[PDB]
Enzyme design. Sequence first.
Site, PDB file in Angstrom:
ATOM      1  N   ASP A 139       2.854   1.958  -3.542  1.00 33.54           N
ATOM      2  CA  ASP A 139       2.289   2.530  -2.346  1.00 33.54           C
ATOM      3  C   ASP A 139       3.437   2.767  -1.371  1.00 33.54           C
ATOM      4  O   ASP A 139       4.608   2.503  -1.678  1.00 33.54           O
ATOM      5  CB  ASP A 139       1.184   1.624  -1.761  1.00 33.54           C
ATOM      6  N   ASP A 195       4.176   1.878   2.741  1.00 32.46           N
ATOM      7  CA  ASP A 195       3.739   1.025   3.840  1.00 32.46           C
ATOM      8  C   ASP A 195       4.404   1.473   5.137  1.00 32.46           C
ATOM      9  O   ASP A 195       5.630   1.599   5.193  1.00 32.46           O
ATOM     10  CB  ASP A 195       4.097  -0.446   3.555  1.00 32.46           C
ATOM     11  N   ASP A 250      -0.484   2.551   3.253  1.00 37.32           N
ATOM     12  CA  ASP A 250      -0.989   1.521   4.144  1.00 37.32           C
ATOM     13  C   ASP A 250      -0.434   1.768   5.544  1.00 37.32           C
ATOM     14  O   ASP A 250       0.774   1.976   5.702  1.00 37.32           O
ATOM     15  CB  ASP A 250      -0.609   0.119   3.661  1.00 37.32           C
TER      16      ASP A 250
HETATM   17  O1  UTP Z   1      -0.293 -10.790  -0.815  1.00 39.60           O
HETATM   18  C1  UTP Z   1       0.408 -10.125  -0.027  1.00 39.60           C
HETATM   19  C2  UTP Z   1       0.709  -8.737  -0.197  1.00 39.60           C
HETATM   20  C3  UTP Z   1       1.520  -8.157   0.695  1.00 39.60           C
HETATM   21  N1  UTP Z   1       2.090  -8.806   1.751  1.00 39.60           N
HETATM   22  C4  UTP Z   1       3.041  -8.173   2.696  1.00 39.60           C
HETATM   23  O2  UTP Z   1       2.795  -6.771   2.713  1.00 39.60           O
HETATM   24  C5  UTP Z   1       3.956  -5.989   2.285  1.00 39.60           C
HETATM   25  C6  UTP Z   1       3.546  -4.794   1.490  1.00 39.60           C
HETATM   26  O3  UTP Z   1       2.799  -5.182   0.349  1.00 39.60           O
HETATM   27  P1  UTP Z   1       2.785  -4.237  -0.933  1.00 39.60           P
HETATM   28  O4  UTP Z   1       1.667  -4.828  -1.773  1.00 39.60           O
HETATM   29  O5  UTP Z   1       2.777  -2.786  -0.534  1.00 39.60           O
HETATM   30  O6  UTP Z   1       4.135  -4.647  -1.731  1.00 39.60           O
HETATM   31  P2  UTP Z   1       5.645  -4.069  -1.667  1.00 39.60           P
HETATM   32  O7  UTP Z   1       5.681  -2.891  -0.713  1.00 39.60           O
HETATM   33  O8  UTP Z   1       6.528  -5.181  -1.314  1.00 39.60           O
HETATM   34  O9  UTP Z   1       5.859  -3.555  -3.142  1.00 39.60           O
HETATM   35  P3  UTP Z   1       5.191  -2.318  -3.927  1.00 39.60           P
HETATM   36  O10 UTP Z   1       4.363  -3.063  -4.997  1.00 39.60           O
HETATM   37  O11 UTP Z   1       4.260  -1.703  -2.895  1.00 39.60           O
HETATM   38  O12 UTP Z   1       6.282  -1.498  -4.492  1.00 39.60           O
HETATM   39  C7  UTP Z   1       4.711  -6.990   1.462  1.00 39.60           C
HETATM   40  O13 UTP Z   1       6.081  -6.688   1.337  1.00 39.60           O
HETATM   41  C8  UTP Z   1       4.501  -8.286   2.222  1.00 39.60           C
HETATM   42  O14 UTP Z   1       5.300  -8.267   3.373  1.00 39.60           O
HETATM   43  C9  UTP Z   1       1.892 -10.148   1.965  1.00 39.60           C
HETATM   44  O15 UTP Z   1       2.411 -10.730   2.899  1.00 39.60           O
HETATM   45  N2  UTP Z   1       1.025 -10.719   1.052  1.00 39.60           N
HETATM   46 MG    MG Z   2       4.256  -1.388  -0.781  1.00 41.60          MG
HETATM   47 MG    MG Z   3       0.954  -1.820   0.780  1.00 40.35          MG
END
Ligand code: UTP
Ligand code: MG
Ligand code: MG
Length: 327
Positions: A193, A195, A251
């Site tokens: 995704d 963010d 997001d």
């Molecule tokens: O269980 C969770 C999930 C997410 N998060 C917080 O939300 C941010 C975004 O969560 P993402 O699920 O988008 O992960 P990511 O961007 O680090 O990796 P991709 O799988 O998307 O490539 C994460 O980096 C973390 O800071 C949490 O704190 N807890």
């Molecule tokens: Mg992400």
């Molecule tokens: Mg996300």
Amino acid sequence: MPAYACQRPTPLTHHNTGLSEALEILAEAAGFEGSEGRLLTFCRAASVLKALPSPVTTLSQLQGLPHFGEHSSRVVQELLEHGVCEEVERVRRSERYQTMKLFTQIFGVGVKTADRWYREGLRTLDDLREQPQKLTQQQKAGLQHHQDLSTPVLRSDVDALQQVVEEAVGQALPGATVTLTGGFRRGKLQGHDVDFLITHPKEGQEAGLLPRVMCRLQDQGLILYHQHAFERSFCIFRLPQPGSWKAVRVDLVVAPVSQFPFALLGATGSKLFQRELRRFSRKEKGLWLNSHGLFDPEQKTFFQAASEEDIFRHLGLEYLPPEQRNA
DNA sequence: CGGCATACG
DNA sequence: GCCG
Ligand SMILES: O=c1ccn([C@@H]2O[C@H](COP(=O)(O)OP(=O)(O)OP(=O)(O)O)[C@@H](O)[C@H]2O)c(=O)[nH]1
Ligand SMILES: [Mg+2]
Ligand SMILES: [Mg+2]
Ligand SMILES: [Cl-]
Ligand SMILES: [Mg+2]
Ligand code: NA
């Protein structure tokens, strides 16, 4: 090697990729079985290896490393000796693991829903499509778009998306800003995704912003799915492609500028890094950390932060840039 | 043994 | 599953 992942730099690429991948399979499998503790230990052991300066070549190199006990050491020992760990390979091929992975990868399906479907005998995405009365609108969207959402988002995709979010944010509230967070801020070249974190330099002006942003994106035909006062949205966007388009998860988070450093820290991850940082704060410093602030429960006061650097300083930790938070 | 991150949609 |  310190015991918490927030106490050491963890780069995105490292010198123990195969070993860490194997431990992360066991962590994922432990989560699917409801054992959050075992998930954490295997995740933490994997992350220790990511933080090492060179490859582990002999079992003796695990001596003294935190989170390596009998089980994680045995896994590494087998990989070093035979190139494969039988327990890991048994998990990999297991119907339970493969189906729980498939189901939880869906947007709107978590471990508990996946597990219930598994126990009911469901195994495939078409099994789910053939019983749509059992699905929420969110799960229906996750399933309709599953193929596109299983395609990695590329850094090229991120730039085009940030432009359209900025356009909508600009009409919704002039002067509001858009910051890329999550894995792309940590330097990842791909993601599941995109963010974003949105704020405005005048405290309070951000109130009511996200509905105005979402309505404007929806009016432009860019929103394939969203949940609709609110401050976080979990959406599916229409992103252009040569001669067509693809669905992408996006997001959006809105925070007041007073909380922006905490929201940025909390949204930049990694997930394990944030859990470890929050655990460190509470257990070692007696302070409660979340994406809004840092609370001293004895003085009943919140710590004002103007930067992520401030937050690391108030926790007594050396600053880590996002690229070194890949725990 | 207890503990294992956190809050919004 | 491991730590304190
Ligand atoms: O269980 C969770 C999930 C997410 N998060 C917080 O939300 C941010 C975004 O969560 P993402 O699920 O988008 O992960 P990511 O961007 O680090 O990796 P991709 O799988 O998307 O490539 C994460 O980096 C973390 O800071 C949490 O704190 N807890
Ligand atoms: Mg992400
Ligand atoms: Mg996300
Ligand atoms: Cl430190
Ligand atoms: Mg116990
Ligand atoms: Na899911």
